[PDB]
Amino acid sequence: DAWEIPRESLRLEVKLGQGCFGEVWMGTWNGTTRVAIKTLKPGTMSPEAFLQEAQVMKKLRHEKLVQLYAVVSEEPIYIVTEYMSKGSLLDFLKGEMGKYLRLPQLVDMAAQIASGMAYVERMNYVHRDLRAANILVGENLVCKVADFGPIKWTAPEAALYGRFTIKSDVWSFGILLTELTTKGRVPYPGMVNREVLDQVERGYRMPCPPECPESLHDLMCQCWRKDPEERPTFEYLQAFLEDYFTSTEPQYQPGENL
C-alpha cells in the first residue's frame, strides 16, 4: 500500500500524551516534515483490523479534518498525521488561551468544526464521538475534527437505541457549542451520567450560558430537538455560524468573558 513508509523515516521527538488508541508524539518525517506520530501497543489491534479502520482516514480529505500522512501497518503499528500545534480544543479552552477568547473567536471555531462535519455529512459518514476532546487546534485558531469513533455528548436515540446518524452528531455539536461558550466546562454541571439521560428524555435542556446571546442558545436548542429529522444540517450550521455577527447578532458588544 502507498501509505506505507519505512520505520527509519520517523523520529519521535516529544511525547504529547495519550491518544484514543495509543500514545502520541511530536516528530519528524523524512527528516523534513513536522508530524504527529501515534504508536499502538502490540496487544491492541491486529494489522488486518487496523487496515479496515484506517480506511476511513485514507478515504476522507478535507481542510478541517486532521489529515493522515502515512502508516506503518505491521506491529508495532505507527500512525502519522499532520501536527496540530495547540493540542485538543478542550485543553485549549481550559488553559491560558481561554481567557482571551471571546464570542467572535469561539463562533469562528464552531464554524470550522461545522465545516468539517458538513464534509462528513456530504460523504454520508458519521462521526459518533464529536466533542471538544476530539477537536484539535493549530496555528491561527485553526480547528480540525479528529478521532472518528460519553453520555453527556450523546443524543438520546443513539445512547438508548443505537441510532447513530449525522443527526446524532448534530446533537453532539450542540453540546460542543456549550463547551466553547463555557471555555471547556463539563456539560450538565453537577449532574452524573444517570441523571442526564433521564432528564433529557423528560425534556430537560441546558440553559443559556452566562453572557452567551440568546440567539446562539436557540441554535443549541435546534441541535437538541427530540426528533432527529428536525435538527438542522451541518450545511445550515456552517452558514449560520459564518454569517453570525452580520445576520444574527449585528449589535454584538464584547463582554468580560464573551
Minimum gap (Å) between residue 82 Cβ and ligand 6G3: 6
Backbone angles phi, psi at 56, to 5 degrees: -65, -50
Site string for ligand 6G3, 2-31 (x = CB under 6 A): --------------xx-xxx--x-------
Q: Which of residues 184-213 bind ligand 6G3 (CB under 6 A)?
A: none
Tell me whether residue 52 is annotated as binding: no
Whole-number Å distance between alpha carbons of 89 and 86: 8
Site string for ligand 6G3, 42-61 (x = CB under 6 A): ---x----x--xx--x----
71 scored as a contact of ligand 6G3 (CB under 6 A): no
C-alpha cell at 188: 450538565
Please say which residue, 7 or 194, places its beta carbon nearer to ligand 6G3.
7
What's the min distance (Å) between Cβ of 16 and ligand 6G3?
4
Tell me the H-state helices in the chain: 47-53, 55-59, 89-94, 103-122, 156-161, 166-181, 193-201, 214-223, 234-242
Report the SS3 class of residue 29.
strand
Contact 139, 176 (CB under 8 A): no
67 is in an annotated binding site: no
Q: Kindly state the smallest distance separating residue 72's Cβ from ligand 6G3, in Å.
A: 11
- 194: burial class by Cβ within 10 Å (0-12, 13-18, 19+)? exposed
- Contact between 39 and ligand 6G3 by CB under 6 A: the answer reads no
- Is 21 annotated as ligand-binding? yes
Query: Which are the catalytic amino acids?
Result: 129
Q: What is the DSSP letter of 248?
A: I
Q: How far apart are CA 209 and CA 206, in angstroms?
A: 8
Residue 99 C-alpha cell reads as 481567557
Count residues contacting ligand 6G3 (CB under 6 A)? 25
**Coil, helix or strand for 143?**
strand
**Per-residue string for binding with ligand 6G3, 126-165, x by CB under 6 A?**
----------x---------xx------------------
Where do contacts with ligand 6G3 occur on this chain (CB under 6 A)? 16-17, 19-21, 24, 36-38, 40, 45, 50, 53-54, 57, 66, 79, 81, 83-84, 87-88, 136, 146-147
| Binding-site residue positions for ATP | 16-24, 38
